[PDB]
Tab-separated table of C-alpha atoms and ligand atoms in Angstrom:
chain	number	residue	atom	x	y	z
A	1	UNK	CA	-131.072	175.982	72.454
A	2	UNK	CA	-130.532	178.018	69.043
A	3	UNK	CA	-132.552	180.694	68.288
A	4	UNK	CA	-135.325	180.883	65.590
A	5	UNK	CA	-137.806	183.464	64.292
A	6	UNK	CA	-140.711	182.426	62.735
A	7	UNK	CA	-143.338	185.077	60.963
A	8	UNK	CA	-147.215	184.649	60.523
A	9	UNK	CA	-148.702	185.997	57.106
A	10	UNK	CA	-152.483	185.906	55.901
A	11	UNK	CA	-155.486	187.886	55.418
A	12	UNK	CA	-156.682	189.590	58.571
A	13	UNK	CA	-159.758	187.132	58.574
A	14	UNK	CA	-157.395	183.922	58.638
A	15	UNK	CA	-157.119	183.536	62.168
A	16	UNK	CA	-153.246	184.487	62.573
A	17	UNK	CA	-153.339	186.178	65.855
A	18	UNK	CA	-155.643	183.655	67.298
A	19	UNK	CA	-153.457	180.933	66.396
A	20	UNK	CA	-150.288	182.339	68.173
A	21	UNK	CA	-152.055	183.472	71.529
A	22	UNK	CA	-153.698	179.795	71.793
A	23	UNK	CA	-149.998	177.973	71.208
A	24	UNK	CA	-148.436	180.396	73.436
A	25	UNK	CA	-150.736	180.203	76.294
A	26	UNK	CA	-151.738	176.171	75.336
A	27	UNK	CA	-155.238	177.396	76.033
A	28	UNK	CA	-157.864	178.981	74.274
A	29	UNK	CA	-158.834	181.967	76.553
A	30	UNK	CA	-161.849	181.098	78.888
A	31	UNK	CA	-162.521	184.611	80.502
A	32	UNK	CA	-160.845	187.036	77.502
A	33	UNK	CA	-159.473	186.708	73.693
A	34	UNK	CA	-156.539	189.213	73.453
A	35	UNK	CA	-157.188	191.695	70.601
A	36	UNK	CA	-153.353	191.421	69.957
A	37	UNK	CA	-150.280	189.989	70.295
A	38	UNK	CA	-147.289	191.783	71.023
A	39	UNK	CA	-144.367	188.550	70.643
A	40	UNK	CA	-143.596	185.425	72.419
A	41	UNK	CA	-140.628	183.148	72.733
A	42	UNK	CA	-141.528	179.804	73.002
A	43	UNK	CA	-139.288	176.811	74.222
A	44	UNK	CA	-140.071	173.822	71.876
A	45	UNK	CA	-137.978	170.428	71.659
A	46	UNK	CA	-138.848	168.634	68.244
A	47	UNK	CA	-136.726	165.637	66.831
A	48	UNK	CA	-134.517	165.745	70.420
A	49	UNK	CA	-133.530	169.423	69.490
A	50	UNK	CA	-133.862	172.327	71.545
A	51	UNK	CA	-135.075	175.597	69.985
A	52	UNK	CA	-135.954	178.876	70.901
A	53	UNK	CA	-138.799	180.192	68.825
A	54	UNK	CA	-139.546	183.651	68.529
A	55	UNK	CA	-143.469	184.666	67.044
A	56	UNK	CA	-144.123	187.711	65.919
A	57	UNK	CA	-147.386	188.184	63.733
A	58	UNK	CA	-148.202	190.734	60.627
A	59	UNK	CA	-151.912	191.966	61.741
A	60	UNK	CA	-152.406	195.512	61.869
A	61	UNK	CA	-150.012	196.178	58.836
A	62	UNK	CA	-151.789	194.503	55.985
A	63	UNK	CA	-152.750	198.287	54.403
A	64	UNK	CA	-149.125	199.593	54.938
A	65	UNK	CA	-146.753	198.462	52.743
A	66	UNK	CA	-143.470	200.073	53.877
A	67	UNK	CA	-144.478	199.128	57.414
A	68	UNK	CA	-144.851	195.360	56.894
A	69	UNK	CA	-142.251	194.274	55.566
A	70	UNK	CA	-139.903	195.411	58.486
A	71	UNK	CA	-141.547	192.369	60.203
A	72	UNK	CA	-139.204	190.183	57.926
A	73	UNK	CA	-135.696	190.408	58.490
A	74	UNK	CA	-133.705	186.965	59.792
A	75	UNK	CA	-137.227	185.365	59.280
A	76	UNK	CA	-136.175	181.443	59.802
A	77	UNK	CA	-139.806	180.059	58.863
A	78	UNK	CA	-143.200	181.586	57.334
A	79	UNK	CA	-146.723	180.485	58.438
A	80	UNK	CA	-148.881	181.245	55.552
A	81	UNK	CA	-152.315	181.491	56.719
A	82	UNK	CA	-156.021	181.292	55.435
A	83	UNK	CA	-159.148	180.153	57.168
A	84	UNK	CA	-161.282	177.296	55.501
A	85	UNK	CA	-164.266	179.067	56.409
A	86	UNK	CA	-162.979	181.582	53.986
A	87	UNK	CA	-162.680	180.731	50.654
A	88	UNK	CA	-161.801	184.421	49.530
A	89	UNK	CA	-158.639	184.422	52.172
A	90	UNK	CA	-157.310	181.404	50.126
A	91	UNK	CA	-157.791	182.724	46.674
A	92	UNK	CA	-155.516	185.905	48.432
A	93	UNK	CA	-152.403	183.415	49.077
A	94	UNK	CA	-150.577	182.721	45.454
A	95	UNK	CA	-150.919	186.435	43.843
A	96	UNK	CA	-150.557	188.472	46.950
A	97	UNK	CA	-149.131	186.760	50.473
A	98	UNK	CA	-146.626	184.403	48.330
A	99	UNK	CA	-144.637	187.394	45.979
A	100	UNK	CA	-144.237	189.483	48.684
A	101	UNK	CA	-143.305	186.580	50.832
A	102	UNK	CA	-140.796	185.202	48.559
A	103	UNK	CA	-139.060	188.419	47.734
A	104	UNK	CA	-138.274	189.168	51.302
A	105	UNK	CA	-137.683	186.101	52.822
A	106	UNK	CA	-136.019	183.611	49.643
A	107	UNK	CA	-135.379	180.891	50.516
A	108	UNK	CA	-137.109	180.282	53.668
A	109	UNK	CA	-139.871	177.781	54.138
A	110	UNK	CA	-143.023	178.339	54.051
A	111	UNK	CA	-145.753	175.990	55.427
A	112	UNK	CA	-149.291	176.618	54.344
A	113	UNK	CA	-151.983	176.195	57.149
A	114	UNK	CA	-155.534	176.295	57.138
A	115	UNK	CA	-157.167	177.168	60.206
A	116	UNK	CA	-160.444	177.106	61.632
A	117	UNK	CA	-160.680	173.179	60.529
A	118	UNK	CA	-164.000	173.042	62.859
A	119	UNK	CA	-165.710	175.282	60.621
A	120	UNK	CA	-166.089	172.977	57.931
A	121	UNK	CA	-168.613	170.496	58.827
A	122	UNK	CA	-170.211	173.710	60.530
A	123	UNK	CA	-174.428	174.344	59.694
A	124	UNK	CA	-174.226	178.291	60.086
A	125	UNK	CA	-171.110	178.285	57.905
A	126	UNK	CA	-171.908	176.389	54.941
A	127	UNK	CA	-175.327	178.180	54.542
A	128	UNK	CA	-173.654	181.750	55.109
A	129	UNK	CA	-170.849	181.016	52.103
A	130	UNK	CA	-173.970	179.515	50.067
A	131	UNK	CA	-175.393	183.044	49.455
A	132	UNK	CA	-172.175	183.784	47.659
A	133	UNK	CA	-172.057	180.622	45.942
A	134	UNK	CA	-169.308	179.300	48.345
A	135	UNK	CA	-168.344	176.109	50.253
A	136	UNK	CA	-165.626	175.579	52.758
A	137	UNK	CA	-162.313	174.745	51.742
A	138	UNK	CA	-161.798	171.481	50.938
A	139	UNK	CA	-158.296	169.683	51.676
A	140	UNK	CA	-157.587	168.841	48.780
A	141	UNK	CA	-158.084	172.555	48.046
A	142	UNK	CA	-155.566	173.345	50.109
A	143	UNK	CA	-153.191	170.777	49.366
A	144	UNK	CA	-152.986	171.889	45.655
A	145	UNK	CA	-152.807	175.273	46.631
A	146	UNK	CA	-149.525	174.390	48.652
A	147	UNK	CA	-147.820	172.387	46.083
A	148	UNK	CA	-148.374	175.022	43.311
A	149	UNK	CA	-146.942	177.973	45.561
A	150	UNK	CA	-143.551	175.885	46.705
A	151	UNK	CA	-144.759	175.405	50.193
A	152	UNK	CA	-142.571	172.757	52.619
A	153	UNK	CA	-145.799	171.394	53.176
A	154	UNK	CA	-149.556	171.722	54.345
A	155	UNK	CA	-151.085	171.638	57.896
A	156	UNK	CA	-154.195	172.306	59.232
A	157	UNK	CA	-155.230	173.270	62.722
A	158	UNK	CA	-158.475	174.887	64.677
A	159	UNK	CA	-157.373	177.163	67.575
A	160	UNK	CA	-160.955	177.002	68.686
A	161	UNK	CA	-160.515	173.557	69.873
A	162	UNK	CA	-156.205	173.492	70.042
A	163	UNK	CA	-156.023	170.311	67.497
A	164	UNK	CA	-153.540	170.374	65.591
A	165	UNK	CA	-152.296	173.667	66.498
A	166	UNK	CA	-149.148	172.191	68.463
A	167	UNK	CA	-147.953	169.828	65.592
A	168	UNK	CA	-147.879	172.971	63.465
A	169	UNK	CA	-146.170	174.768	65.283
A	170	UNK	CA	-143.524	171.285	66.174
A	171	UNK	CA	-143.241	171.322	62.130
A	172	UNK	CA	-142.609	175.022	61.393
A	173	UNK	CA	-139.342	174.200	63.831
A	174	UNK	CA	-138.436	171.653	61.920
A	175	UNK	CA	-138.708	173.241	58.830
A	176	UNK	CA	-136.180	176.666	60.330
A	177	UNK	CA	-133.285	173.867	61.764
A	178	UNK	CA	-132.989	173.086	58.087
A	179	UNK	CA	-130.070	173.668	55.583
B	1	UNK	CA	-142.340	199.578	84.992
B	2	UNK	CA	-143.165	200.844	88.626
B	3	UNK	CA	-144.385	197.892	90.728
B	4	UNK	CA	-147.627	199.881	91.139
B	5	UNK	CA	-149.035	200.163	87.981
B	6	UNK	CA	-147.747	196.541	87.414
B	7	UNK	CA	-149.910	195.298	90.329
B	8	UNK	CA	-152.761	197.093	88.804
B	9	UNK	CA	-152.187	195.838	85.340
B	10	UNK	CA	-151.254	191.966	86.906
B	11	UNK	CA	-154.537	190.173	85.402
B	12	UNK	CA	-155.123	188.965	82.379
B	13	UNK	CA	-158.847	191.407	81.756
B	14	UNK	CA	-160.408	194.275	83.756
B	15	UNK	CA	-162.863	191.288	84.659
B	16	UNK	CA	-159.825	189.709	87.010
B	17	UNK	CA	-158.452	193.051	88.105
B	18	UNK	CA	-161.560	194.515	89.879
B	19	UNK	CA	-163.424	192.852	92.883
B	20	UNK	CA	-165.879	190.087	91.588
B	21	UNK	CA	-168.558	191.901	94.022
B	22	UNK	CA	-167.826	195.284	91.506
B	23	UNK	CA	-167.946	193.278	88.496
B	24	UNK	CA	-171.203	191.815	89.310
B	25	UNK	CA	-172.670	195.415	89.769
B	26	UNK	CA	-171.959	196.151	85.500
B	27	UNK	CA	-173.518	195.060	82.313
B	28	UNK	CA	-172.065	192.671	80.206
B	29	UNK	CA	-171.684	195.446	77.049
B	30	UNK	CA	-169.934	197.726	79.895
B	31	UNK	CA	-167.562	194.366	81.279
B	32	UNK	CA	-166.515	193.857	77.028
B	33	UNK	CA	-165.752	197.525	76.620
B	34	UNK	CA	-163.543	197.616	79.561
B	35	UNK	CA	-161.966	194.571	79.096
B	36	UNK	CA	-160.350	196.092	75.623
B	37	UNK	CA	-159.658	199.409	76.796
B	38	UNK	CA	-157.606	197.583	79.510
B	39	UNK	CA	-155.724	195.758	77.446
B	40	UNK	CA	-154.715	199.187	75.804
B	41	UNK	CA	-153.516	200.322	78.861
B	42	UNK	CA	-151.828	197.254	79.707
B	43	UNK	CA	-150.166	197.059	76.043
B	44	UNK	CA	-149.438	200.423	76.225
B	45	UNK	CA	-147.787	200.016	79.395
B	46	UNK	CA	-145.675	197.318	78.418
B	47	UNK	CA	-144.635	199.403	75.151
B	48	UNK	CA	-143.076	202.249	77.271
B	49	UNK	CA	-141.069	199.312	79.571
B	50	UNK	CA	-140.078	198.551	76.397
B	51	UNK	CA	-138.564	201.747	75.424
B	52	UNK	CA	-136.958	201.904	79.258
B	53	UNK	CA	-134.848	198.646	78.219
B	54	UNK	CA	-133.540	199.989	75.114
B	55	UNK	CA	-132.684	203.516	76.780
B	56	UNK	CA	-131.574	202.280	80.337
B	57	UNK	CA	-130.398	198.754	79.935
B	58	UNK	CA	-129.039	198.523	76.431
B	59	UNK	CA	-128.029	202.250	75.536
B	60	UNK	CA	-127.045	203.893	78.426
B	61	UNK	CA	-124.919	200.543	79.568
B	62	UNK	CA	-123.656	201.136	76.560
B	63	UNK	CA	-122.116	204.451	76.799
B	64	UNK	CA	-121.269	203.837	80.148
B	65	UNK	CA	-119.702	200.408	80.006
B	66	UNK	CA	-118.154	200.047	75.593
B	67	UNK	CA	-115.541	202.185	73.906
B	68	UNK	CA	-117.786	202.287	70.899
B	69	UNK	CA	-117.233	204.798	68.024
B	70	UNK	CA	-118.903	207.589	67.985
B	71	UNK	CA	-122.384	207.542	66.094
B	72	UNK	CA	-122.728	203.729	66.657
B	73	UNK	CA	-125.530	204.270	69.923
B	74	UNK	CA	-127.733	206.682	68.611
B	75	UNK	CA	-127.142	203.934	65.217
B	76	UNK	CA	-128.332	200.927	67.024
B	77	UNK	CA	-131.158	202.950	68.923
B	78	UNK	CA	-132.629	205.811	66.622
B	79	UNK	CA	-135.295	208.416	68.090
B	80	UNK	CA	-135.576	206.017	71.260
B	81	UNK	CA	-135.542	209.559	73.430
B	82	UNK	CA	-137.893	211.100	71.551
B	83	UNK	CA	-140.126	207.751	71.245
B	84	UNK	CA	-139.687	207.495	74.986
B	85	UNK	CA	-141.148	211.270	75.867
B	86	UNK	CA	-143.783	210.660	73.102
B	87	UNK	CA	-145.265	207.080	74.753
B	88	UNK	CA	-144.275	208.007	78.631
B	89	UNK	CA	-146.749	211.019	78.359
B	90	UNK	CA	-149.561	209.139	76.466
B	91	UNK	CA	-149.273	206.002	79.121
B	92	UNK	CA	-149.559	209.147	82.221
B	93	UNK	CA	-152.878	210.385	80.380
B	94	UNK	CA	-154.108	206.872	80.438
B	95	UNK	CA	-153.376	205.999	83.977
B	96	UNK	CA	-154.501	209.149	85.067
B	97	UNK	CA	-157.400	208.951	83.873
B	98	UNK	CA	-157.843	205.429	84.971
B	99	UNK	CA	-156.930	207.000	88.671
B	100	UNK	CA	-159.765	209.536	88.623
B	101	UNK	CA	-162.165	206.949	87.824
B	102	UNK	CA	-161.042	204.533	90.751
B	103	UNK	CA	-164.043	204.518	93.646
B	104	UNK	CA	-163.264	205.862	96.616
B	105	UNK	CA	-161.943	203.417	99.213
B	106	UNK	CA	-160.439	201.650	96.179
B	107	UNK	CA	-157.361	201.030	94.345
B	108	UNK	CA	-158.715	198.598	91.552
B	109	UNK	CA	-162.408	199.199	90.477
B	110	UNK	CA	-163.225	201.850	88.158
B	111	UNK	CA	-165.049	201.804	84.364
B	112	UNK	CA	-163.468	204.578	82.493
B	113	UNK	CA	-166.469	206.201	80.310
B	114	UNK	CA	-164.588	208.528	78.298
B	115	UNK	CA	-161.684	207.445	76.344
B	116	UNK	CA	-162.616	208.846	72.962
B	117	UNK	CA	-161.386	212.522	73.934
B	118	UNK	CA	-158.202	211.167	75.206
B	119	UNK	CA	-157.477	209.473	71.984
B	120	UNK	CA	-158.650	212.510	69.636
B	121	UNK	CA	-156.535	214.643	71.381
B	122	UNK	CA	-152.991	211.865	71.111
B	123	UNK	CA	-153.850	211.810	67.467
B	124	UNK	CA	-153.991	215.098	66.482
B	125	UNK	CA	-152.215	218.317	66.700
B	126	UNK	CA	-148.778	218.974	67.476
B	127	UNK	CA	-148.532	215.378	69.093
B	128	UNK	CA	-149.530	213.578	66.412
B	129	UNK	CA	-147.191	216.175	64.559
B	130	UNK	CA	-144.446	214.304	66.245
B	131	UNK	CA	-145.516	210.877	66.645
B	132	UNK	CA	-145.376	211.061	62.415
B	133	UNK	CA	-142.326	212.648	62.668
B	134	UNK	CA	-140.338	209.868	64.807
B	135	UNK	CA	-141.985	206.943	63.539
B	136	UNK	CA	-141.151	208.429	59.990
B	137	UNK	CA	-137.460	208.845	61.190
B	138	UNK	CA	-137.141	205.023	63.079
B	139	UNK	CA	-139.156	203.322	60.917
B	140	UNK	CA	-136.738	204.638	57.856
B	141	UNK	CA	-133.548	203.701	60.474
B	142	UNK	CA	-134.949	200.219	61.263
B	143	UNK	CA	-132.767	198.182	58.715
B	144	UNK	CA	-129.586	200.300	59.741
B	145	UNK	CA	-130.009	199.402	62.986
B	146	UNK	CA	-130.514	195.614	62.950
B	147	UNK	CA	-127.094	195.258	60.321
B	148	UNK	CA	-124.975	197.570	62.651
B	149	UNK	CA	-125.942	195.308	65.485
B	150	UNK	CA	-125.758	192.115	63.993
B	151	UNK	CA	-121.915	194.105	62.753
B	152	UNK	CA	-120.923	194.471	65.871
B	153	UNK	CA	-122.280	191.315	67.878
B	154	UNK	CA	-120.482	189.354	65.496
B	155	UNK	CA	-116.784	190.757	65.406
B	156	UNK	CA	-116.390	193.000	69.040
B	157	UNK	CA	-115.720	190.713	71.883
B	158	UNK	CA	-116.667	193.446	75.068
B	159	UNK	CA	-119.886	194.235	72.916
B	160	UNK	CA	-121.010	190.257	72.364
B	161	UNK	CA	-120.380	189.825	76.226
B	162	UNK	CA	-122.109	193.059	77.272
B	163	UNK	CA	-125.239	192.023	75.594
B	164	UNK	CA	-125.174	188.244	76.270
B	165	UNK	CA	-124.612	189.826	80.340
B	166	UNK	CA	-128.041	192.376	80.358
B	167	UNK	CA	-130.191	189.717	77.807
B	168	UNK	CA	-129.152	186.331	80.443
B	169	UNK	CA	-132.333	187.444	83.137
B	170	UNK	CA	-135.511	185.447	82.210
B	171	UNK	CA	-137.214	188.732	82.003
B	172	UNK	CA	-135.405	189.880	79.008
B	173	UNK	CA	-136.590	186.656	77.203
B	174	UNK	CA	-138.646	188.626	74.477
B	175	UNK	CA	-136.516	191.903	74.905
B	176	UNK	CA	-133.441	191.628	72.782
B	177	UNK	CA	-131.923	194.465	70.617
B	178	UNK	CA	-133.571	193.428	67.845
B	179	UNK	CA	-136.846	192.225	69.253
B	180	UNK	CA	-137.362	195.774	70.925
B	181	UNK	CA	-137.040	197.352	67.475
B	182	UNK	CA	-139.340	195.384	65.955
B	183	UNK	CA	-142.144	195.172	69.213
B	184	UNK	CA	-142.173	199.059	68.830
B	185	UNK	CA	-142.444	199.616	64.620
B	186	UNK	CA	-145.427	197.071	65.357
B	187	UNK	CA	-146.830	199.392	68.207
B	188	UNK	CA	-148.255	201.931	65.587
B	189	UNK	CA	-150.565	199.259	64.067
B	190	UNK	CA	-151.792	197.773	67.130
B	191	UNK	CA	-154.044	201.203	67.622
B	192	UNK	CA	-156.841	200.679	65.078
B	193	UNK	CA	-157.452	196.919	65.801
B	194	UNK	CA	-157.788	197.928	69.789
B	195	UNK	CA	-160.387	201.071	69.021
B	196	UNK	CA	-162.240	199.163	66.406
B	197	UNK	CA	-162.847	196.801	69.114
B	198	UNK	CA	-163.525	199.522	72.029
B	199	UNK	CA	-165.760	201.235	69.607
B	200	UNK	CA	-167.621	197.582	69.118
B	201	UNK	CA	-168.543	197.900	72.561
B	202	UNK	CA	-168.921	202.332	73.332
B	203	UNK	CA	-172.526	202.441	71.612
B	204	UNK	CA	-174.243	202.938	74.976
B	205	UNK	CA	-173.613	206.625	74.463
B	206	UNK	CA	-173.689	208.575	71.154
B	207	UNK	CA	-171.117	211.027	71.597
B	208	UNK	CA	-168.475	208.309	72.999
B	209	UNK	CA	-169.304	206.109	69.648
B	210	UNK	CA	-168.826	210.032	67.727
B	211	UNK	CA	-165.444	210.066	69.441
B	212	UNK	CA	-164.120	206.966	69.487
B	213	UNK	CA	-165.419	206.930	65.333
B	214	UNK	CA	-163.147	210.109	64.620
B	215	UNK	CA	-160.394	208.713	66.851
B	216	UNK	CA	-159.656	205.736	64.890
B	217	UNK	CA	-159.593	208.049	61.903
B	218	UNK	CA	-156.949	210.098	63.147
B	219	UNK	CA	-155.042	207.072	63.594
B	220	UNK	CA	-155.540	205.604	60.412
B	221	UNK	CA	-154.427	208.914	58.703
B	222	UNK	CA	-151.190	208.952	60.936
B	223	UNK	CA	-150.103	205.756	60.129
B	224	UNK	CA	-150.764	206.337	56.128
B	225	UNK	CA	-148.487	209.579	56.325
B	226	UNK	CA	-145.607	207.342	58.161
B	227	UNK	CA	-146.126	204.585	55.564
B	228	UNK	CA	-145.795	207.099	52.456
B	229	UNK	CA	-142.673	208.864	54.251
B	230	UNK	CA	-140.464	205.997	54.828
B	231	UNK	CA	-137.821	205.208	52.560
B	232	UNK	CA	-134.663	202.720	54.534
B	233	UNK	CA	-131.852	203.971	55.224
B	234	UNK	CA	-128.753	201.531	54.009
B	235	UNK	CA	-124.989	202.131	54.929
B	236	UNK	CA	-122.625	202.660	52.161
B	237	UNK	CA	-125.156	203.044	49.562
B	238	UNK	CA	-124.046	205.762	46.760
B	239	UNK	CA	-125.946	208.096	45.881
B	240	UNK	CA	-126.669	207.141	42.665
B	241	UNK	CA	-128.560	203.895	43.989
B	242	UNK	CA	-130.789	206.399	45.767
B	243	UNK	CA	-131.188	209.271	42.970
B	244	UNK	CA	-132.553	205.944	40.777
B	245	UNK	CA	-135.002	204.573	42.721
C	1	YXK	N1	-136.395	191.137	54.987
C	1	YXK	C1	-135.516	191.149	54.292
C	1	YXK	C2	-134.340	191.144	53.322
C	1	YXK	C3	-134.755	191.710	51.968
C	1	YXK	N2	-135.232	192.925	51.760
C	1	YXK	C4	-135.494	193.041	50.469
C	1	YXK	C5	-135.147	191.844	49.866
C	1	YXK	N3	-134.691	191.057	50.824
C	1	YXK	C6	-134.232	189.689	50.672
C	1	YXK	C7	-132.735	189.568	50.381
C	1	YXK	F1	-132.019	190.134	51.397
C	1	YXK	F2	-132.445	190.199	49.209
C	1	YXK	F3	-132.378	188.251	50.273
């Protein structure tokens, strides 16, 4: 089992920290949601390969920019997140997340993901963003928005309800065992 | 960590850790605020076993088992002394204060009403005088340390087997070199997201919301001073590289 560090990135209202306490605990919490997350190795086995994968996540440091970046030495793989009930945290990806992103870490991949999926077909959310002449995300939203920003590829997930969150995280291993 | 406070911080939420016939007696508004200011004390306690690794396991087995050169310990592990004192006293005030709250006849239910003072008084003054200071100082060392250990991992033999010897335990799982070093630069900006959320929950009385409101400004302006004073540190580079940046 080779060793792998993989790095979270996103707006604080993406979802990020959610995300990694749901795969690391395969549960969403039933009596308590953890205001942070401290790190995690998880042992994952994609494509008949053994991998140790350590998370580490970015909230907390989004306002200090000499602080954040020491998240992203050896980074082997970048989650770069934004929530589809969020508009505004997508629009924050290609001229913020991905400069920064690419300048510290070239090279590595980067998959975009778009959480909170269960939010889109959501009542209270699609009247809320209406006010502000919004909508949620749509797919092929986020698909373009990978492609233009040189993303490995596009996933999307809900932590609230665990879909798709372990295929993401199967996939970002993937992407850090290649050349 | 002692296997005391362990026991006492075993659950995951003040909700598991206190007798369900205590809970019951509480509020749901008093349950959510001491579910998050447990899992400060919890994190917090975890952050100081954290700095016992990297000054008892890693560099004191170190010194006492490697013929390293000298300046290559306090190298790999900058401030980790200082950062040690600076946590170990901060976790005591917690737990103590946590300890005077406990009922009698009790070892595990208590609701801790005043944490605002606590946390005013951590982030200002002369401590917060040196808790910029040292995260100023490791946070600037950070990149230093992670090349000189990556240096010697790679080419000294006794050094590679030393650490692949203290990291084999399934405890040390998360707790390499280079995972501690990065689990306590992230420590600073843990603080505001776990008062914001305290302070969610401390409206109940006005002076604790007061506290708790010019507590998490304190913090905020201690980790903007370490941000603006760090600058890393790189071996070899010339002054010139420096003078021009
Ligand atoms: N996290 C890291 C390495 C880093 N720091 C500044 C730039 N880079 C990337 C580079 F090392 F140049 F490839």
């Amino acid at each position: 089992a080779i060793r792998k560090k993989l790095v979270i990135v996103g707006d604080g209202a993406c979802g990020k920290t959610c995300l990694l306490i749901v795969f690391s605990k395969d549960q969403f919490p039933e009596v308590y949601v953890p205001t942070v997350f401290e790190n995690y190795v998880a042992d994952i086995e994609v494509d008949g390969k053994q991998v140790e994968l350590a998370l580490w996540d970015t909230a907390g440091q989004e306002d200090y920019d000499r602080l954040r970046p020491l998240s992203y030495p050896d980074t082997d793989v970048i989650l770069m997140c934004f929530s589809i009930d969020s508009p505004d945290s997508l629009e924050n990806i290609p001229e913020k997340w991905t400069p920064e992103v690419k300048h510290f870490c070239p090279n590595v991949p980067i998959i975009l993901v778009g959480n909170k999926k269960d939010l889109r077909n959501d009542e209270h959310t699609r009247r809320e963003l209406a006010k502000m002449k919004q909508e949620p995300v749509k797919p092929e939203e986020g698909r373009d928005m990978a492609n233009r920003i040189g993303a490995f590829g596009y996933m999307e997930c809900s932590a609230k309800t665990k879909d798709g969150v372990r295929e993401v995280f199967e996939m970002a291993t993937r992407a850090a065992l290649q050349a | 960590s002692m296997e005391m406070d362990e026991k006492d911080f075993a659950a995951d939420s003040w909700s598991l850790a206190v007798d369900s016939s205590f809970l019951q007696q509480h509020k749901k508004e008093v349950m959510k605020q001491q579910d998050v200011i447990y899992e400060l004390i919890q994190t917090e306690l975890h952050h100081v076993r954290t700095l016992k690794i990297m000054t008892r396991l890693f560099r004191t087995g170190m010194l006492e088992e490697l013929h390293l050169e000298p300046g290559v310990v306090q190298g790999l592990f900058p401030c980790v002394d200082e950062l040690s004192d600076i946590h170990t006293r901060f976790l005591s005030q917690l737990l103590e204060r946590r300890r005077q709250a406990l009922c009698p006849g009790s070892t595990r239910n208590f609701v801790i009403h005043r944490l605002g003072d606590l946390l005013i008084s951590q982030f200002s003054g002369p401590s917060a005088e040196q808790m910029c200071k040292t995260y100023s100082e490791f946070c600037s060392r950070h990149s230093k340390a992670l090349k000189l250990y990556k240096e010697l991992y790679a080419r000294d033999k006794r050094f590679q087997q030393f650490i692949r010897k203290v990291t084999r335990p399934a405890v040390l799982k998360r707790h390499g070199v280079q995972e501690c070093i990065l689990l306590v630069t992230q420590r600073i900006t843990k603080y505001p997201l776990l008062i914001s959320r305290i302070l969610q929950h401390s409206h109940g009385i006005e002076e604790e919301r007061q506290d708790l409101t010019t507590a998490l400004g304190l913090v905020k302006e201690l980790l903007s001073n370490v941000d603006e004073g760090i600058y890393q540190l790189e071996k070899g580079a010339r002054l010139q590289e420096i003078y021009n940046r």
